[PDB]
Amino acid sequence: DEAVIDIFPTGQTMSFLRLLHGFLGTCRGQSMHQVLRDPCVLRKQLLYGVCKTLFDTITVRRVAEEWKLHAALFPYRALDEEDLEQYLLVWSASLRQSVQTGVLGALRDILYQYADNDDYGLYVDWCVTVGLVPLLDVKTKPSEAAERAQFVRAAVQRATETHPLAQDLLQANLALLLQVAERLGAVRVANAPEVRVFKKVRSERLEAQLRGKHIRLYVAAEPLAYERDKLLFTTPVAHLHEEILRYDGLCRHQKICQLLNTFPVKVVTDAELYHLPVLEAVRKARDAAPFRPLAVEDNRLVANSFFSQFVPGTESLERFLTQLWENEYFRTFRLRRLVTHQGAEEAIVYSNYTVERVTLPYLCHILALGTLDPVPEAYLQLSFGEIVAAAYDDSKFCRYVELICSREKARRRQMSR
Amino acid sequence: DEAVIDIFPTGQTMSFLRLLHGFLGTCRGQSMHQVLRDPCVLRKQLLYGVCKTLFDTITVRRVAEEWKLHAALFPYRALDEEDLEQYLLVWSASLRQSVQTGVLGALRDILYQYADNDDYGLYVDWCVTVGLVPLLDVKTKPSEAAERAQFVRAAVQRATETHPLAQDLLQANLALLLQVAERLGAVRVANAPEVRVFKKVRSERLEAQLRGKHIRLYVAAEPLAYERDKLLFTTPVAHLHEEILRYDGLCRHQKICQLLNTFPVKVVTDAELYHLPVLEAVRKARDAAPFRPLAVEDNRLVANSFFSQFVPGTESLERFLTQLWENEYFRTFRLRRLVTHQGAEEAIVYSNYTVERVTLPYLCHILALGTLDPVPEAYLQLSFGEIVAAAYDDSKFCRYVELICSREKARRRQMSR
Amino acid sequence: KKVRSERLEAQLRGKHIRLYVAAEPLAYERDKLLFTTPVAHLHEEILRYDGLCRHQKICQLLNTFPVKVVT
């Protein structure tokens, strides 16, 4: 038996998941936590990384090789003035859109079948309120690897039917595809009851265990510890814990005092109410909250009374706490507010510092990070499908279609002149 | 036994890390401390330093040497009008992009594997609240140096695969890479309980010891000391300690006076409420906060009463303290406020004076400072990957690509004319 | 939610059926488990608003008469 200071199952910390999901208190600033826990930015950045590693491979050779088949496939190019200048652009658009829908359908299938893990939507909570995440590594029989390796072939058959030329990149990088698929379904966020995490005091090598079994864990922001043996956190949400405690105390206090003096006079010594007419309501309300006096006996020392009627003003410190929440979440991750002219809070989105602080640590512990790349920020706002049309636009893929365009127009301009 | 005046484990200073992380005091100002303890600016500045030291080395010779391989690799350049003017730019962009992704992936791997130390966050706390930092120098066996020297090769193999020419810079500067990697994991921020720092009175050579063992420490702003044996600090946070302590006293005072006059009348002589309807709630409210009189016996001297109902106005001095926090942190570190037109507090970021005050002292005591260079302020806002593209754009790397493309176009313009 | 094997299921009238999950809620020593859905973030506030609505109605319906006397 060893003495070890614990962090998880106490009121200060188990209350954190209650408040951050608003079990006991909330305000107008809680929605920015909701826009922080978007699970779709995970699949967006993930597909951006895998397609950036996909498209950049065979840009230099395969375009001139697959020019040959579509040369005979489109019988054209009689005159150099009007046919050549217009045919190359629509052929280039055709090839890029066909490989685009191919990779889009294959990636949408292999995501939507087994990337609905919704674990990031707890991972950002553990990153934001304790500065570390408990997480389990579920292991299975290697027959499930054969299940996924079978499934990816019928997945890429939808791209095979769409495009013959798109399948050549996928048959090259199927190892990377099955790698990110297996590492995708390998690790969870450990939402299981009676978990316990702690800090070992004699060697500062704090560890996570689940149900008596020691597990792996990640640390992003370790909290500071001193002679106060309950240690203090550097995490963002603990910077505003006591303020929402004050707001919740004021909320309950306001409620319990406004339900205290409902009756009009004091001396000392169910939507049914709307439906029925007022002549039964005056009978039922007068009998409903009964008049009750209040008295304690005291002989030859009589009462001298005073009286107070007030409710606490919730709106002032409500606005104060919402402004504090908004300022806090804006400073700790630099959330942008793109609006129109004279527009107020149209849309709030992840920005450049934000994805580096939260998303790339997720892919760091996922250990798929060795190939991928963080997404541009306006690229994050764009569609699930339109994103790849800009992703290879960033790549040298259509930039080499520019080079084969210049080569074909030069080879035919010398043919004319 | 010697008498030595201590600074660390007293109420004025143990209170400091509690108030700065908001265990007691809080307002809209604490978020600017959160934007000051952002640890990613450390990794951005250090990667900027190592890539600026990287890219300027072999600018003058290797570009003309590696022109030779991509001359035969791209069969082109038949006509001088359209082929030369367009091919050279995309070749230059391809080369800079490929070496960029190579150094980016290698640096991201060697960062994300062992630069999640998050020590900078506490380092800026000790710089801001006591003007000096305690820190330990952990030393291990040299087998860990061999582990890192093994790990960097498999790290730069990811750059070796994508680009052959990028490995030649890394094999030249691998000593610098292992140096900054070893000095990266060399020192910590001393987050261990029961440490003690003090000032020796007879010899003014103030020192830090950890658990009976004397250690090294850094001093940035030593506090002034006089015949008052408790000494006064010149640090920024002690300039406004008493005001947030006043705010905390007023907050607790407001809470305790608001929770005192809850009952409507006075004489002299947990969401349980919301769910349940009002008719049992009015039963539970009167029994919940019971009426209590107050009485002291006094014969032939009777009571003559008075009454006060007031709450303290928290919002006025709250706004005062937030403006205090805002202009205080603005003047001590010249933080910029870039916004849009009619824009209020979009983003706050380090400027040129701020990094010189807080970051380069960190790299000074790191002792990797002899080869690096501070980052421009607008460069700090940019992406984790986009930063290197402007980093060698500042360098003469692509500036010599301008010289070699002018040389190629001159050598072929003389070939034509 | 089946407690020993975390493989929560849907049954209809004694017959087990299929179901979909999009956002699974977090579960702990509190055997009533807490939800991460958008609407549960604002359950208590609209419940407070309804308590205030009913309370306003019942206090307005209480002091309708212009004069009140005691005895």
Author numbering:
A (entry chain K), B (entry chain L): 52 to 320, 488 to 635
C (entry chain J): 250 to 320
Give passages from the manuscript.
Here we present high-resolution structures of the A- and B-capsids and in-situ portals of human cytomegalovirus. The portal proteins are believed to orchestrate nucleation of the procapsid through the formation of a portal–scaffold complex, which facilitates procapsid assembly. During the maturation process, the disassociated scaffold proteins are expelled as the viral DNA is pumped into the capsid through the portal located at a unique vertex of the icosahedral capsid. All three capsids possess a mature icosahedral shell and are distinguishable by the inner capsid material: (1) C-capsids are filled with viral DNA; (2) A-capsids appear empty and are assumed to be products of aborted viral genome packaging; and (3) B-capsids have a featureless inner core consisting of scaffold proteins, likely generated by an unsuccessful initiation of DNA packaging.
